[PDB]
Design a protein around this ligand. Structure first.
Ligand code: SF4
Ligand code: SF4
Lengths: 94, 80, 33, 143, 720, 67, 733, 159
């Protein structure tokens, strides 16, 4: 592959089909050691996907429900309720 | 894959074979007509279902029939 | 306790989220027998 | 009989500037196709993916994403020019399947040795009603 | 054409349709470029003859069945009328009281203003013009016969583009502009000055007297007393009386100053005379178009523009596509500039004429642009040949068509969201009782600051960047000046707010989508990933079968089919915007104390930011005139309104269905006719797929456009 | 041996259900004498079918002689 | 059974997004599933039916519970003509304060919706009085829904799965459903009316805790046993009776009065009880016709084989029809759908003219809503009947077993049937449209006296024969002396004649030329829709263009561009085309009903009578005139309680327009665009790390037709619902 | 300056200044997503920090409570809610796309053809670690932006 205008090679299909890494970098970690140690320690319990999905869904639903049920009336008009006498209906309807 | 069938009213004119865009059909020897040949469909895994072959057939009713079936990457003509 | 303030978010937001997640995971499975 | 030709991987490709209509991830993961031919001289032709290319004198090898593209280009080569061609299917593991022309003779020309597939020896009006194949898993045309 | 079309399909009715569909597709009849060119030349002469006949009709109807003479004496309180109907089955109710002791149909073509600007004062002059136009139509017909059946030119004559450009630039446009400037200086200017001085039209001197008596013309402009001496002595300032650079509008007639127009046409004539000496024909001086094109290379490897001369010299369709695009764009620009800077006297206060002219020329421009797309696609299918006529730039475009189309698709989606979703946001907020959360002037503001900056620059231009101009080019820019004629507003500064921002981005969205459809049709006319050999199927074919998932409407013709709908959508929104904005903020009546009352009282700013506002305050409110017209002179508009709704509804039967159903039904109907022995000699067939699409789109566009036509005319005649 | 099928120019009625000219009338052009030919009778019709063809091949038991 | 959908390996192996869409679309077509058998088909259908019953019970339980919890049923009972019933409360956090103020109605403490389904009047008429009754009903219906789910699970297990022979027992099912499902249910409802609802209409509160200690009649069962049945009718409620009270109350429980209750403007409950008693006994008699296992009864097969004319033009008659019906489920579904659609239209026609619920005639919005709702449902059911008939012809019909019977002959002369339907449609369309256009031209030229105004004299004669005296005719029941008049002179004439001669109601409304024109328009719609559906059904097996259509199934895209082109050639496509005509016909019907009634209710019938004879009259005086209050639901100056209906009006217009995109543009354009999008995604940095697992493709041809039709229908329904409700309720509440 | 990608004319891509400029290559290679040899958790931390920090502004300044003395808290809470939704969707994509124990699906070739270690991001465990880092960083960045804007009250052009 890549010799005398040849782009096909059965011994290297990855090159022939263009399965490259255009921008991937092989450089080592640029982050400081202590910073990485702190983040590895404190972000560990969130790295389990099966537990994370259930935790996110349940906790988020609970938090949303709690926020909705505890909203101040001055912030949410639907909580404040009507403040004016009702408008009359047509032909005497109430 | 789609299904393609040839019926014995074929007159062996070869037009359906020429019309196919994916080389599904071919001609084989026969003794049932004056032309002494009949169409065949050995490569239906490459058939896309365009029905050009039916458009090319001169008999009434048709001697080549295409029945659309389960869809695949080849039948849907996907290049990605 | 205002029941609508709790139930409307659950039926409009949380339950659709759970149902859509479960249906997506069910239709993405490569092996269901 | 007929011995299918072997695919030579050291065959040059036509001179082309590139385009956005070439191969995609399907060639990497599923399959692609290769068409080869021999040209008497160097000359301009139309790519099936858009744009124009220059075919070299001698052997030419071209990579494409679908069999339909290969057959369209081959028909153009046979009709406009007078060039014999053949194309193959290539799999990600490297195995090669020779495709066309299948037995060295074009399908539209009758040739001995071909076995019939999908032939019903009756007129099309003799197919049964669907009720006769209900719950049986067959087709009224599958005989 | 008739013989071959009949021989193709003699046994079925289909051939009949083909006979009409392929009448003028000359390239399909023969492959010889010379014969095609000769046919095109003769057909062009035929079109010119038809146009001359139409002009003759207009002038004759103005001379015989019009109140032009009465209107000339009182333009403000008399409505133009040039069509009268016979008293049959009660249709004489259409002869309404237009004014000046005349009953007829009021016209909105603006011919009275044009004739007044030309200086025509009597019916005899209109008769003479009609007779001359008839003579010219006959001459065009004879020339069309002669240059095809007797004296057809050769192919090398047609391919002389240098000479054609020189003659058409210096002879057609330059000399035409100069001769019209002569007419305006010597005929239209004094006649219009006398008319503006309140002189009886039958007492105004005849135009030729102004040529045979210098003393008569010197009383209006003293410079004419010196004759042609200042011109030869280069003391041109003496002609400053009738060659001005004022700007603005004439306060008496509401149009542009005629002296400005004469000076403009003189300058244009000089410019085109200079431009017409660029290309080399026979004397070894001038440029070569091929050399100019081949001299523009680029850093992107080889030179790109090389080879375009051969393509544009050997393909009629490429020339037609490019010329259609340019001419359509010119028509749209004409509409804008004619509304904003009214060139005819008493045109600005004739609201019906202004609305009609703007809308009509917008429609013409849109149709022409779509035609440009269609013939570009036809060139791609039929004349493109890289092995014989190669061009680099076209090849590169074809090699990144995918990137082009993907970027255009994204920009269309972005524009659609961030423009129409703002209207939807406004509707939702208003319905929810939250007006403080809307996108409006009294809420979250989206000001078109760049347009306002341009308006301010053009309003403050006189005296700084254009010292020689008395006022700005238009009263729309600003300056705080209002021009009123006969108690009606002609023009005044046009404010721009949040609603204008929203609607302009609507226009951008619709235009980008129409471009997406047409350009996709062009760039994939020959092939695609789905259909590798689409060029062999042709320009106009219904599909390539139900395979590959289904391939309906892949041809470039079907792209033109869809682009027509999107063009209709875009232009309809444009003309609705114009109508509502002009009625709300410009047109109106001014009292003796300077109080301005607009037709709809300035409701555009607050009502046009929601879809419900357009539904209620534009459609529902302004349809009152058309739906209440029965029993009056405008009842024909109500009848046409209903009929156009009917035609539009009828088109959906063709657009929604398919031909297999109709052929199967025709089978039973044919059985019924056979049983009674009344069978037709020609076998009936259902319309082809392509013909079904064509019929559907034609009746859809006709119904919609005619509906809007009746609505606009009824509203503006009854209220403006 | 005598030739099989009707003579040239004979008027026949079509009995094939899926034929465009079913229960119609055609004229015999020629009959193939090869015993292996499954549809030897060539029939021509006045009206073309949906595909533009006006001739077809039929078996002996798919046609009926009419006068 | 590898991945979704599990019931189809052809779809499960599909690598595109199509696999998902069709997976949803084919889920309930059991006959097409892999390795399906007849017994499994019947069992799955049984379980699905139990599911449908469970859903229905849950729906009605929810309605009852929300009315009890958030409604004002008790206040509405006290003031029926002035209190607006409440459907349910509103809790929407997107609301602004003005919306909260505007939607607070009916005495509630917060924003609510006003009910238009008529449940208040219905439940009040059948004896419900308090919130506790509604709560008990809701709980009982919830229990019934749970029981339905349990039974659906139970009859699917191996122990309790019925066999095919049980499912194919027609005689026993017919006997049980006639005697038990209809007769016994009607008898039980008569018992409810006598024991509970009628006492409730007189101030007597009878519940489960005292119904054994309260006599429905003062003399109990004495008159029934002694044979003096007339004693159950001698003291009916007087003309000054107040419905909820004992003032003027009688004691009769079965009568033959006729006419309307003067206060509630609805039918007497006593007449309803007697009617249901008679119907119950008629069905009980009818339910003993067929032999199951006791040696007495008729055989359906024998009856079908017997009816064969000796020399008439019918061939073998009804021979073999029993097997065809009993072996084809699609035939049974077609017959059932046809009957149910007819019944739905009859219900719509009779409930507006002969109301049975107290105070519902005065609730104009409810009347209009109910009529429009049930007529649209009936139209959809009518289309479905013919769809499943065509399906029967494709999948189940066997010519050999149906030789020379009625089905074979119907297939044999399909051309004549189609030709005659086509002629009828052409005649109706030509002459009706011509009359309308002639009248429009006469109005345009200012000569309204030259209109062609044809009186509907046959319908006027029928109205006169039923007792109406508006037109001055002297046909039966309107003349002083007559045999038919004298026979029923004392039976029911005193009430019926008074009812028909009071024009305040909707009983035999006065009609004129506009009624004639619009009725012939409705006839055109019926005949043309029938033409489309019948042509689809009879050509479903094949035609000259496609003689082998039965081998391709009920629904397929086309047969390609050959033979001249074959778009929309399948029977499914005929159903698709017929839905548009059904919508158009029902639109005409409901426009007519609503305009006539809205002009009657305002006291301005001259408006309809004068404007309905030309089309501009319909456009201006019905649509444009009645849209003003609706379109002012919100505007730059504020909003009111109609804002939701204005928003829904615009929403319907938008969905209707969106359907046009799918209907007009077709697939190949979109597929070509999607390929470009796929390239773009694969080439974009930071986004090509994300990969689709189902390859994106454009929607299929048939899928596009279905989606476009769905958007069209939803937009149609929502737009007209918004207009109807807003226009009626803005004027009347 | 426009060439076929990596010199192959028949791969469906092109090299342009937009795609192949050395500055563009350096910038893209120094982003967290393309640090193929670094731990997925830390790259997820960086991505989450950035996006959670940037999400505060729109919610705080455009929301329904923008004209209320609690607008900053509302904006921060909205940003946290959006971060939670995005984390759920990331977990869904990871569960659907990657089996447990399957090898990495990332390319193992450089532009010059040199073989490399496949990126561990394209695995079940790697994607889960990246998602956990993203959630933690998003919450932390939202809190940090809120602290800078509405606790210290630093001078900003609009707040
Ligand atoms: S349908 Fe198209 S691809 Fe299939 S056999 Fe016929 S011509 Fe070939
Ligand atoms: S529906 Fe019509 S246009 Fe579409 S593939 Fe079928 S025949 Fe062609």
């Amino acid at each position: 592959y890549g010799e005398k205008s040849v782009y096909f090679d059965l011994e290297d299909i990855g090159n022939t089909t263009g399965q490259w890494d255009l921008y991937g970098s092989d450089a080592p970690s640029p982050y400081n050691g202590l910073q990485s140690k702190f983040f590895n320690t404190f972000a560990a319990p969130f790295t389990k996907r099966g537990l994370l999905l259930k935790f996110l869904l349940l906790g988020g639903g609970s938090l949303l429900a709690y926020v909705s049920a505890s909203a101040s009336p001055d912030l949410l008009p639907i909580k404040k309720g009507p403040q004016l006498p009702p408008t009359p209906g047509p032909r005497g309807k109430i | 894959s789609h299904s393609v069938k040839i019926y014995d009213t074929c007159i062996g004119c070869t037009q359906c074979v020429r019309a196919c865009p994916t080389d599904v059909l071919e001609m084989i020897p026969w003794d049932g007509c004056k032309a002494k040949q009949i169409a065949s469909a050995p490569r239906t895994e490459d058939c896309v279902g365009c029905k050009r072959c039916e458009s090319a057939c001169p008999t009434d009713f048709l001697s080549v029939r295409v029945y659309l079936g389960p869809e695949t990457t080849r039948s849907m003509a996907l290049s990605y | 306790l205002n029941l609508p303030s709790i139930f409307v978010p659950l039926v409009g937001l949380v339950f659709p989220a759970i149902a859509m997640t479960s249906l997506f995971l069910y239709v993405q499975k490569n092996k269901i027998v | 009989g007929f011995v299918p030709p072997q695919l030579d991987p050291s065959t040059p490709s036509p001179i082309f500037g590139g385009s956005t209509g070439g191969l995609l991830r399907k060639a990497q993961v599923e399959e692609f196709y290769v068409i080869t031919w021999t040209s008497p001289k160097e000359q301009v032709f139309e790519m099936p993916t858009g744009g124009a290319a220059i075919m070299r004198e001698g052997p030419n090898l071209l990579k494409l994403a679908r069999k339909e593209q290969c057959l369209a280009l081959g028909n153009r080569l046979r009709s406009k020019y007078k060039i014999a061609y053949q194309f193959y299917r290539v799999f990600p593991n490297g195995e090669v399947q020779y495709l066309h022309p299948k037995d060295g003779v074009y399908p539209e020309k009758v040739n001995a040795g071909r076995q019939g597939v999908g032939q019903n020896f009756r007129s099309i009006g003799k197919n049964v009603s669907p009720i006769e194949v209900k719950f049986t898993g067959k087709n009224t045309f599958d005989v | 054409h008739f013989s071959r079309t009949l021989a193709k399909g003699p046994d079925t009715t289909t051939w009949i349709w083909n006979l009409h569909a392929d009448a003028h597709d000359f390239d399909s009849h023969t492959g010889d470029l010379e014969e095609i060119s000769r046919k095109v030349f003769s057909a062009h002469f035929g079109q010119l003859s038809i146009i001359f006949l139409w002009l003759s009709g207009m002038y004759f109807h103005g001379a015989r069945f019009s109140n032009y003479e009465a209107w000339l004496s009182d333009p403000t309180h008399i409505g133009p009328s040039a069509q009268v109907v016979w008293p049959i089955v009660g249709q004489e109710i259409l002869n309404g009281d237009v004014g000046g002791g005349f009953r007829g149909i009021q016209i909105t073509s603006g011919f009275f203003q044009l004739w007044r600007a030309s200086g025509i004062t009597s019916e005899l002059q209109l008769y003479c013009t009609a007779i001359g136009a008839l003579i010219f139509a006959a001459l065009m017909l004879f020339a069309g016969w002669f240059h095809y059946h007797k004296a057809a030119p050769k192919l090398a004559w047609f391919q002389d583009v240098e000479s054609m450009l020189n003659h058409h630039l210096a002879g057609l446009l330059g000399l035409g502009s100069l001769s019209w400037a002569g007419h305006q200086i010597h005929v239209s200017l004094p006649i219009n000055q006398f008319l503006d001085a309140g002189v009886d039209p039958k007492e105004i001197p005849l135009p030729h007297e102004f040529i045979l008596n210098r003393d008569l013309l010197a009383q209006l402009y003293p410079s004419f007393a010196e004759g042609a001496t200042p011109f030869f002595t280069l003391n041109w300032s003496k002609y400053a009386e009738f060659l001005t650079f004022r700007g603005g509008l004439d306060p008496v007639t509401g149009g542009l100053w005629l002296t400005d127009i004469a000076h403009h046409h003189l300058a244009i004539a000089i410019l085109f005379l200079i431009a017409g000496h660029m290309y080399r024909t026979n004397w070894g001086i001038g440029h070569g178009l091929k050399d100019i094109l081949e001299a523009h290379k680029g850093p992107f490897t080889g030179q790109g523009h090389k080879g375009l001369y051969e393509i544009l010299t050997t393909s009629w369709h490429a020339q037609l596509s490019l010329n259609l695009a340019m001419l359509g764009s010119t028509t749209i620009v004409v509409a804008h500039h004619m509304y904003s800077m009214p060139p005819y006297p008493y045109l600005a206060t004739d609201y019906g004429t202004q609305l009609s002219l703007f809308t009509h020329h917008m429609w013409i421009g849109g149709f022409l642009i779509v035609g440009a797309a269609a013939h570009a696609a036809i060139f791609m299918v039929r004349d493109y040949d890289p092995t014989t006529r190669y061009n680099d730039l076209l090849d590169r475009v074809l090699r990144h068509r995918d990137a082009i189309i993907s970027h255009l698709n994204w920009v269309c989606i972005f524009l659609g969201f961030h423009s129409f979703g703002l209207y939807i946001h406004n509707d939702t907020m208003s319905a929810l009782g939250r007006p403080q959360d809307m996108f409006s002037d009294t809420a979250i503001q989206l000001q078109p600051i760049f347009a306002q900056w341009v308006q301010n620059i053009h309003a403050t231009a006189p005296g700084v960047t254009a010292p020689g101009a008395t006022t700005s080019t238009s009263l729309t820019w600003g300056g705080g000046e209002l021009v009123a004629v006969g108690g009606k507003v002609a023009l005044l500064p046009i404010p721009l707010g949040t609603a204008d921002f929203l609607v302009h981005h609507i226009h951008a969205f619709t235009i980008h989508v129409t471009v997406l459809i047409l350009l996709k049709g062009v760039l994939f006319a020959r092939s695609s990933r789905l259909i590798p050999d689409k060029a062999n199927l042709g320009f106009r074919f219904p599909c390539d079968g139900p395979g590959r998932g289904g391939t309906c409407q892949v041809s470039a013709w079907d792209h033109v089919f869809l682009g027509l709908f999107w063009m209709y959508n875009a232009i309809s929104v444009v003309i609705f915007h114009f109508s509502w904005k002009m009625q709300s903020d410009v047109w109106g009546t001014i009292s003796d104390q300077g109080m301005v009352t607009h037709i709809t009282g300035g409701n555009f700013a607050q009502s046009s930011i929601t879809i419900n506002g357009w539904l209620r305050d534009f459609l529902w409110a302004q349809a009152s005139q058309v739906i209440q017209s029965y029993g009056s002179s405008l009842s024909a508009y109500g009848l046409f309104f209903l009929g156009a709704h009917f035609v539009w509804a009828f088109s959906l039967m063709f657009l929604f269905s398919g031909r297999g159903y109709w052929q199967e039904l025709i089978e039973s109907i044919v059985w019924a006719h056979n049983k009674l022995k009344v069978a037709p000699a020609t076998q009936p067939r259902a319309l082809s797929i392509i013909q079904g699409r064509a019929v559907g789109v034609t009746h859809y566009l006709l119904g919609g456009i005619a509906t809007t036509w009746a609505f606009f005319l009824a509203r503006i005649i009854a209220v403006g | 041996p005598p030739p099989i099928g009707p003579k040239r120019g004979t008027k026949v009625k079509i009995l094939r259900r899926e034929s465009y000219w079913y229960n119609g009338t055609g004229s015999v052009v020629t009959v193939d004498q090869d015993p292996n030919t499954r549809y030897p009778v060539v029939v021509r019709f006045a009206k073309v079918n949906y595909a533009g063809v006006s001739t077809n091949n039929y078996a002996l038991d798919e046609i009926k002689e009419v006068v | 059974e590898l991945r979704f959908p599990r019931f189809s390996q052809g779809l499960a192996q599909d690598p595109t997004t199509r696999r998902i869409w069709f997976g949803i679309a084919t889920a309930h077509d059991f006959e097409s599933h892999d390795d399906i058998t007849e017994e499994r088909l019947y069992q799955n259908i049984f379980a699905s039916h139990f599911g449908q019953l469970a859903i229905i019970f849950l729906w009605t339980s929810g309605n009852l519970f929300h009315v009890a919890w958030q409604g004002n049923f008790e206040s509405w009972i006290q003031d029926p003509l002035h209190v607006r019933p409440i459907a349910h409360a509103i809790w929407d956090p997107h609301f602004g304060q003005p919306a909260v103020e505007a939607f607070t109605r009916g005495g509630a403490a917060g924003p609510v919706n006003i009910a238009y389904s008529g449940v208040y009047q219905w439940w009040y008429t059948i004896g419900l009085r308090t919130n506790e009754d509604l709560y008990t009903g809701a709980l009982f219906l919830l229990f019934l829904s749970t029981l339905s789910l349990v039974a659906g699970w139970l009859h699917l297990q191996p122990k309790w799965k019925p066999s095919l022979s049980w499912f194919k027992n027609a005689e026993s099912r017919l006997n049980h459903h006639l005697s038990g499902l209809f007769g016994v249910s009607s008898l039980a409802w008569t018992g409810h009316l006598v024991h509970v609802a009628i006492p409730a209409s007189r101030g007597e509160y009878v519940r489960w805790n005292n119904f054994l200690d309260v006599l429905p009649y003062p003399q109990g069962l004495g008159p029934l046993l002694t044979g003096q049945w007339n004693l159950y009718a001698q003291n009916p409620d007087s003309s000054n009776h107040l419905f909820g009270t004992a003032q003027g109350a009688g004691t009769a429980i079965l009568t033959l009065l006729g006419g309307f209750h003067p206060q509630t403007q609805s039918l007497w409950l006593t007449d309803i009880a007697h009617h249901h008693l008679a119907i119950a006994f008629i069905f009980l008699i009818a339910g003993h016709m067929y032999r199951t296992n006791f040696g007495i009864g008729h055989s359906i097969k024998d009856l079908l084989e017997a009816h064969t004319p000796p020399g008439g033009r019918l061939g073998r008659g009804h021979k073999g029809l029993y097997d065809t019906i009993n072996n084809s489920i699609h035939f049974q579904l077609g017959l059932a759908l046809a009957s149910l659609g007819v019944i739905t239209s009859l219900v719509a026609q009779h409930m507006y003219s002969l109301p049975a619920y107290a105070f519902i005639a005065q609730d104009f919005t409810t009347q209009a809503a109910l009529y429009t709702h049930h007529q649209y449902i009936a139209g959809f059911i009518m289309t479905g009947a013919f769809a499943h008939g065509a399906i029967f012809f494709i999948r189940d019909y066997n010519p050999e077993q149906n030789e020379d019977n009625v089905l074979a002959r119907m297939l044999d002369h399909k051309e004549a049937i189609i030709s005659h339907l086509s002629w009828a449609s052409l005649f109706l369309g030509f002459h009706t449209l011509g009359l309308y256009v002639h009248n429009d031209v006469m109005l345009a030229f200012g000569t309204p006296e030259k209109q062609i105004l044809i009186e509907p004299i046959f319908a006027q004669w029928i109205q006169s024969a039923h007792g109406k005296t508006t037109y001055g005719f002297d046909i039966l029941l309107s003349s002083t002396n007559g045999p038919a008049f004298n026979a029923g002179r004392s039976l029911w004439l005193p009430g019926w004649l008074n009812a028909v001669n009071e024009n305040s109601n909707s009983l035999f409304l006065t009609i004129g030329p506009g009624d004639f024109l619009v009725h012939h328009a409705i006839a055109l719609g019926l005949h043309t829709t029938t033409l489309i559906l019948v042509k689809g059904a009879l050509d479903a097996r094949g035609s000259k263009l496609m003689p082998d259509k039965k081998d391709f199934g009920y629904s397929f895209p086309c047969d390609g561009p050959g033979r001249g082109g074959t778009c929309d050639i399948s029977a499914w496509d005929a159903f698709y085309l017929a839905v548009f005509w059904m919508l158009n016909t029902i639109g005409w019907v409901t426009f007519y009903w609503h305009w006539k009634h809205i002009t009657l209710w305002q006291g301005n019938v001259s408006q309809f009578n004068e404007s309905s004879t030309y089309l501009m009259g319909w456009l201006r005086d019905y649509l444009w005139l009645n849209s003003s209050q609706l379109i002012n639901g919100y505007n730059p100056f504020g909003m009111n309680s109609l804002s939701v209906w204005a928003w829904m009006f615009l929403f319907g217009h938008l969905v209707w327009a969106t359907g046009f995109m799918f209907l007009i543009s077709w697939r190949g354009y979109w597929q070509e665009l999607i390929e470009t999008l796929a390239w773009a995604h694969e080439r974009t940095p930071l986004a090509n790390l994300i990969r689709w697992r189902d390859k994106p493709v454009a929607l299929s041809i048939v899928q596009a037709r279905l989606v476009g039709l769905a958007h069209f229908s939803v937009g149609y329904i929502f737009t007209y619902a918004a207009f109807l409700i807003a226009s009626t309720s803005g004027k009347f509440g | 300056v426009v060439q076929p990608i990596n010199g192959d004319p028949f791969i469906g891509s092109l090299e342009t200044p937009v795609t192949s400029s050395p500055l563009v290559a350096w910038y893209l290679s120094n982003l967290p997503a393309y640090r193929t040899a670094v731990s997925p958790l830390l790259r997820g931390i960086e991505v989450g920090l950035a996006h959670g920090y940037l999400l505060v502004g729109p919610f705080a300044l455009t929301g329904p409570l923008r004209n209320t003395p609690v607008h900053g808290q509302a904006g921060a809470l909205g940003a946290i809610g959006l971060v939670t939704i995005l984390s759920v969707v990331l977990t869904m994509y990871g569960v659907a796309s990657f089996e447990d124990g399957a090898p990495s699906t990332a390319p193992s070739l450089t532009l010059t053809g040199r073989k490399k270690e496949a990126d561990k991001l394209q695995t079940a465990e790697g994607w889960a670690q990246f998602t956990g880092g993203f959630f933690f960083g998003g919450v932390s960045g939202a809190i940090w932006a809120y602290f800078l804007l509405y606790v210290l009250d630093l001078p900003y052009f609009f707040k």
